[PDB]
Design a protein around this ligand. Structure first.
Ligand SMILES: [Zn+2]
Lengths: 110, 89, 219, 97, 131
RNA sequence: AUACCACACACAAGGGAUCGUUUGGCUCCUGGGACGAGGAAGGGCGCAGCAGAGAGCGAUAUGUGUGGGAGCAGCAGCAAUGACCACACGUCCCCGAAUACAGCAUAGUGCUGGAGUACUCCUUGGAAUUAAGCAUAUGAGUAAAGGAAGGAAAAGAAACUAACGAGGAUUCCCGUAGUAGCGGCGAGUGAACAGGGAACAGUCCAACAGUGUAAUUCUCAAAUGAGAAGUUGUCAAAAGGAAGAAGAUGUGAAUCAGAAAGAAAAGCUGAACGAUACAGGGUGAUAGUCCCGUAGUGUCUUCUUACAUACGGUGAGUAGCUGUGCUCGGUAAUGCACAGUGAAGAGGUGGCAGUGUGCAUCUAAGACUAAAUACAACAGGAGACCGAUAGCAAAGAAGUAGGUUGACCGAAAACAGUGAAAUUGUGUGUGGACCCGAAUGGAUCGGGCCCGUCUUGAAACACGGACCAAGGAGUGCACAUACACUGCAAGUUGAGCAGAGGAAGUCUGUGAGGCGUAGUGAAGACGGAAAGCAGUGUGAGUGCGACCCGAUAGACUUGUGAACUAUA
RNA sequence: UAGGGGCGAAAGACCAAUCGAACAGUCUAGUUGCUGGUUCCCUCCGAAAUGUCUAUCAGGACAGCGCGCACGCAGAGAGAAG
């Protein structure tokens, strides 16, 4: 070792290390397209994707940004006059783990 | 001396033809085959990958396995005289 | 690297290369694994981890395609590539819509009336078998390049002209530099469709303005 | 480096939301009461049938001599947790009374 | 252009498929064109040459000659035509084989199953032609 | 130098380079993932009119049925009373888990065993090597050895993160990040939440079953009876369908003639014709129209998939503690065990030991689960790959000929083309080791020690080299870097992934992250100069076989040996 | 009776032409500061075998002496006179 450099630290010592190449990338993309298309026929008039709530992101760094979440809460669904079994039949997603702690967050999802 | 003159005494034969594998490697006194471990139930551990591929499925005839694949392709139709038994089942 | 090999070491009046362990065959004692040996391993074996593709900035790709399009309307460049245009009245060519052609028979008659006869003939007469080992690896015949037809809207004319040797087709919205500058020399001859020619204003915009179709790009 | 620029005072600020009160679940139905009664009852019968274990006897003996701090140390070493020890002492005391 | 991706365009694969052909695929190799008149007498445009049929040689050494088919060699793809031969140093004469595609049919041998073979092909056409 | 030795040229020998060619290899992608007591995989032996090897087949060793249809390659004989092929079925010798057996369940019938194991899960567990020595550490929970399953396997619906104005099963991709930390604080090692996406689905058992009658499962009979299991607790409901996908197979346009020349025209020359078909292959030289296909169009056959009852808040030698051993980035214990000890019904957690107290978030010690992800044998399609000393060891009867006591080890050989050099004979010329400079009709004159290599120094009594051909050694990736070139610029970018498109190319979106736009301190805390980002390449450092070849040695195996020799 | 094991009227003898630790195969292309080799032409510039520290003395690193690209520019391996 000679001259001035940032001191090395390259982790190639382990002889059992595996390599992963990506030559399949264009082909696997084409398969995902063809699966969605055929799935879309099986339920023709209905959208392929369900409706999802809007939630607020996590840390101090992302407070001011809104995002999609997993599912509506039993309270949101009831406030809008629906019942859980009906909501499912009409393509609304449900999440019984989530809790409501604000007035604002509830009003928007309604 | 240990060279040429000792070669003259070498007239006994410790291995014979094995009935499981053919390989002239059954040691008569030990009661064991050095190629395939007969009479143990399982076959012996082969020393390396190169040597074991020389005795794998597909190195011989595969008589039964080939017929099974053709019958599966055809939908397992069976003997045509006995169709009624098949259909009931 | 398949074989069982080991060096004999010094003292035997032989070079200290690894040698093949065997008996009963002429293969006994021959020289095994090294790159200087018959049937040995090559130096630095070729390997799948090599970097096959290459990156180019999006801003350069956009600019290169714009100035390739420009060169298709300078006679000096078009002649320079080797397209022959002695009989053609004016450049660029713009075919109308309301072309109701469906058969190759009538399709060729149209192209002849635009003056392209000598160019098309130049392509048909060109077919030859390639020199070298490429003729064994599915690259047997070579032809000269001819006109490219550019359309934007779906029409029957596309499948009327396509069997004529040296005619090539692409949509304006996804026009590639491999088609616009073959071999890296610019000025390919282009037949425009009337819709496609008007679309160039939406695609590349106007001088010292920003294109609506190509976000973040200006000429 | 885009780290460690604010002071701890300004990191502690917060946006003024409007809260929702928690829904209390205090009502306990008739059937739930009988369920709990039967479980507590069953726990009596076991103690009546089989009695106390060796360390429970030794513990209760120390409580009669007012050896409070000895009993505390003893129970800590048997059960591991100082919380479990404090609870078991209180249950044993109530049994003797 | 070819748009079906199940069919091969490899030189190595096309060549192996030719020389290792058997059964009905081998018979397809022995086809020849019919003359203009016979293409009005029958619906067919081409047929597999058989012994006893009458052929004009249209390419090679024996161009312009006419004669009867003597033999059909399937393994080495060649036909022997009456009166097309070479003479050895001995004076002995050997028939020289001609490749099927260099022939043209002038009269058909109608022995055996030929009339049924022709009928089967004509029907197969009309079945789809009339639809 | 008559005849020896050397060199040059022509002819004949001797060898198989070079150029032209290829029914083989290799790599990437897509499908497939189909064995066995109904005897497998693997071994042996038989079967032809003349038949050794190999291929195919079992004493029925070319039989039956269906769809087709012309010959059986040599010689003799066969064949529309069906040559030959394709699909299915029937027959299927001996050894081998090899079994008239072993273990085990039911009212009974039965099931397991062996083969395969690239990929997945569970155990057990090295050393070479790096630290310029070496003992902790590294290589590495890797190799080796054992057990087990499927077309995938494992995992999976919080005794979960987080402290935000919060989110919400598992798996996979981009990223946080070569960071927080671990470490003879040396060499070196090294995760998680967020933020952007692919694919999306939730449910069961116990606790806890009609008491005006076990209402429950099975067997034989019978048209309504006998018997077995079970009160140490049995029993908690729907048919149903058209879609979707993969194969097989039918059809399928349009040309003739000629001088010269050749063994032969498809070339060349003139005149025509087809195209939703100018992909590719075959024909006696380079074919859209001579043959097989291709674009376009028909038929048929398989496979996949879909509605009902009743419930909650306590699952123990467990969680935890003390000692101990291994393990992890986990650090006054991250996970797993063993021995002592051992709870509560209410308990667990909030990356630093303890005690107390509010607050937030969850519910362990019982079970099931699709999709998105990984990769052999076998089949299909592609390629800026190799072209018979190459590419798989193997382009022919290649794991073959042949070899080891044994475990195990293992070649050569393409075209009836072309036909180099070394080396040999004959003929004709010129010289006596040969090179450089300069010449004659002719004797010759002048200068030169044997190359490569280590070395202060080689012609050396320093080492390697008999001769010719062919092969034969600074390469690929990751991470910082300086230079040259290019676009935009207080900004910049082909992240993954979606939309379009006869498509591994190209075009367009959505949209993170990273680095930059100013620094100082261990930190609390404070704040005041300097164009960057992403590429295409070159020189150079570090880690991986690392310019090519080369030790004596170390370890690991459910691998082999007392035919020589030692002793009972 | 089998390999860190055997067997020995003892020589470190013998255990398949191998024994002061067998054979086969794998980890493994183990490591090497040491020896050998490292393949086309012309043009221009051109060294060192010294100092400090090193389990350092057949090796390294830092500095000194080459070359390439060069922002720029009153200097000099010689004398006088104090
Ligand atoms: Zn055996």
């Amino acid at each position: 070792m000679r001259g001035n450099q940032m001191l090395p630290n390259n982790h190639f010592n382990k002889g059992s290390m595996k390599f992963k190449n990506w030559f399949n990338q264009p082909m696997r993309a084409l398969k995902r397209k063809e699966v969605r298309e055929q799935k879309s026929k099986i339920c023709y008039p209905n959208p392929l994707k369900k409706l999802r709530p809007v939630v607020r992101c996590c840390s101090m760094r992302y407070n001011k940004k809104v995002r999609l979440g997993r599912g509506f809460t039993k309270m949101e669904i009831e406030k809008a006059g629906m019942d859980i079994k009906y909501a499912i039949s009409v393509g609304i997603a449900v999440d019984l783990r989530r809790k409501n702690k604000n007035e604002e967050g509830l009003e928007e999802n309604v | 001396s240990k060279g040429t003159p000792s070669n003259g005494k070498k007239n006994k034969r410790n291995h014979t033809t094995c009935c499981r594998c053919g390989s002239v490697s059954f040691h008569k006194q030990k009661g064991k085959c050095s190629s395939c471990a007969y009479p143990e139930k399982k076959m012996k551990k082969m020393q390396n990958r190169k040597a074991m591929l020389k005795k794998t499925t597909g190195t011989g005839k595969m008589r039964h396995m080939k017929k099974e694949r053709i019958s599966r392709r055809a939908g397992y139709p069976g003997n045509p005289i006995l169709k009624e038994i098949r259909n009931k089942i | 690297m398949r074989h069982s090999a080991k060096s004999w070491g010094t003292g035997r009046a032989m070079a200290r290369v690894p040698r093949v362990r065997a008996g009963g065959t002429r293969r006994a004692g021959q020289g095994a694994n090294a790159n200087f040996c018959r049937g040995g391993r090559m130096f630095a074996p070729t390997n799948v981890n090599r970097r096959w593709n290459r990156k180019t900035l999006l801003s350069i790709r956009r600019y290169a395609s714009a100035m390739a399009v420009a060169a298709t309307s300078i006679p000096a460049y078009v002649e320079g590539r080797g397209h022959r245009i002695e009989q053609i009245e004016n450049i660029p060519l713009v075919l109308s819509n309301k072309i109701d052609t469906e058969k190759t028979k009538e399709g060729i008659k149209i192209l002849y009336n635009l003056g392209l006869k000598e160019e098309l003939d130049k392509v048909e007469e060109s077919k030859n078998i390639r020199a070298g080992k490429g003729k064994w690896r599915n690259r047997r015949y070579v032809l000269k390049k001819g006109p490219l037809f550019v359309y934007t809207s779906e029409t029957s004319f596309t499948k009327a002209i396509r069997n004529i040797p040296g005619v090539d087709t692409e949509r304006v919205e996804n026009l590639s530099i491999l088609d616009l500058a073959p071999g890296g020399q610019a000025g390919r001859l282009i037949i425009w469709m009337e819709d496609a020619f008007e679309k160039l204003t939406e695609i590349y915009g106007e001088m010292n303005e920003e294109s609506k179709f190509k976000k973040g790009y200006t000429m | 480096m885009k780290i460690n620029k604010l002071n701890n005072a300004s990191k502690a600020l917060s946006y003024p939301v409007k809260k929702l009160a928690k829904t209390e679940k205090a009502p306990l139905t008739e059937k739930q009461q009988r369920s709990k009664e039967l479980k507590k009852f069953a726990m009596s019968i076991a103690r009546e049938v089989g009695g106390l274990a060796p360390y429970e006897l030794r513990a209760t003996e120390l409580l009669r001599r007012d050896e409070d701090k000895r009993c505390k140390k003893f129970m800590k070493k048997r059960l591991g947790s100082l919380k479990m020890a404090k609870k078991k002492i209180e249950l044993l005391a109530e049994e003797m009374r | 252009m070819k748009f079906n991706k199940n069919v091969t365009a490899s030189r190595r694969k096309n060549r192996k498929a030719h020389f290792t052909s058997i059964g009905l695929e081998r018979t397809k190799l022995m086809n020849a064109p019919l003359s203009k008149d016979l293409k009005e007498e029958y619906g067919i445009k081409r047929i597999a040459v058989r012994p006893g049929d009458m052929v004009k040689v249209v390419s090679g050494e024996f161009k312009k000659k006419e004669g009867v088919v003597m033999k059909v060699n399937r393994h080495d793809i060649k036909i022997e035509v009456e009166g097309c031969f070479v003479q050895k140093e001995d004076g002995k004469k050997i028939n020289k084989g001609i490749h099927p595609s260099n022939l043209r049919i002038i009269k058909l041998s109608m022995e055996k199953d030929r009339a049924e073979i022709i009928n089967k092909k004509v029907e197969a056409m009309k079945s789809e032609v009339k639809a």
